[PDB]
Design a protein around this ligand. Sequence first.
Ligand SMILES: C[C@]12CC[C@H]3[C@@H](CCC4=CC(=O)CC[C@@]43C)[C@@H]1CC[C@@H]2O
Ligand SMILES: Oc1ccc(C2Nc3cccc4cccc(c34)N2)cc1O
Length: 249
Amino acid sequence: PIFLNVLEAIEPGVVCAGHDNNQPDSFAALLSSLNELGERQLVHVVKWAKALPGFRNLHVDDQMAVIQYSWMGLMVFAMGWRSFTNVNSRMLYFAPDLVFNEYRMHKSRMYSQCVRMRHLSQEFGWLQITPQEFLCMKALLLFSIIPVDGLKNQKFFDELRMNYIKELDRIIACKRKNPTSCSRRFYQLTKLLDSVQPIARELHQFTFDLLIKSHMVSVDFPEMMAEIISVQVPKILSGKVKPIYFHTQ
Ligand SMILES: C[C@]12CC[C@H]3[C@@H](CCC4=CC(=O)CC[C@@]43C)[C@@H]1CC[C@@H]2O
Ligand SMILES: Oc1ccc(C2Nc3cccc4cccc(c34)N2)cc1O
């Protein structure tokens, strides 16, 4: 249970958005708080990524790259898990102080993306995802998006990712008998994981589009979000960096 003990030990606690719930729900106010929340969650993502088994064996530029590419997917997934465990997926639980009901979903102007996020959230319920399956899936999301012409040390990346797939396959296969059950299950979970990607990508277009018009629309982006969204996110939009799918889309 060593790999699982570590994944349960390094898991972030609650991150607050710092949203002032006494302000009226406006676009400016909702998206600036989401942006601050993304910025706060980045600090914790960085510290979590670095405590992961084998992570520091990656080349150091590569460690920065996988995090600056995959943060959107990791946070969407974790948020869907929080929504599921806290409000049985009925609303989007970004943070204790920034929970979206239907009105916030409309005012944020991301209503259809929110719907797709609630759908992802509900799959945790429909699939009866266990906390152990959750933590191994989210660890893998870290290794699920890279540049098309490879990382600085692609071989070390490939080995690591292989090992994360094997740990997920093992977290399933601890507790099952005569096995159509075990294939069907791995199939289900690799389908859930592939499904995070098109969602992440919608939110990549959205937040890029917003950063560009952010002065016209009084939305604040803090230091790191603004930098990652202008430097790394367009490499995803332009197709220089692409998700690693299990099944072909
Ligand atoms: C990227 C973004 C700010 C950060 C958001 C993102 C939507 C999903 C998301 C979920 C979280 O739980 C952390 C914040 C993030 C990562 C927002 C959509 C537009 C906005 O600019
Ligand atoms: O080897 C390393 C790999 C990634 C990082 C790392 N990656 C980051 C991405 C985005 C924002 C950051 C802000 C502060 C520190 C970081 C960031 N640190 C630091 C390292 O020293």
